[PDB]
Design a protein around this ligand. Structure first.
Ligand SMILES: [Zn+2]
Ligand SMILES: [Zn+2]
Length: 73
């Protein structure tokens, strides 16, 4: 029996303007913005996670609008 490891770094920070829409739920770069009937845009990681017990229809969190997943079958 024997082993060992060691490592250290610093890296560099970048100063740029990120004009990429963000999810108002998780607050993460919205990679896949889904504009539901209500309009608001959410991230798959969210819209999906939120749907645990429900079948598919879920009243938008931001606005209480009767929305029901519907699209070209
Ligand atoms: Zn999200
Ligand atoms: Zn909404």
């Amino acid at each position: 029996g024997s082993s060992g490891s060691s490592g250290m770094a610093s890296g560099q920070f970048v100063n740029k303007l990120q004009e990429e829409v963000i999810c108002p739920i998780c607050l993460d770069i919205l990679q896949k913005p889904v504009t539901i009937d209500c309009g608001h845009n959410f991230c798959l990681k969210c819209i999906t996670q939120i749907g645990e017990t429900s079948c598919g229809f879920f009243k938008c969190p931001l606005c209480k609008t009767s929305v029901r997943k519907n699209a070209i079958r």
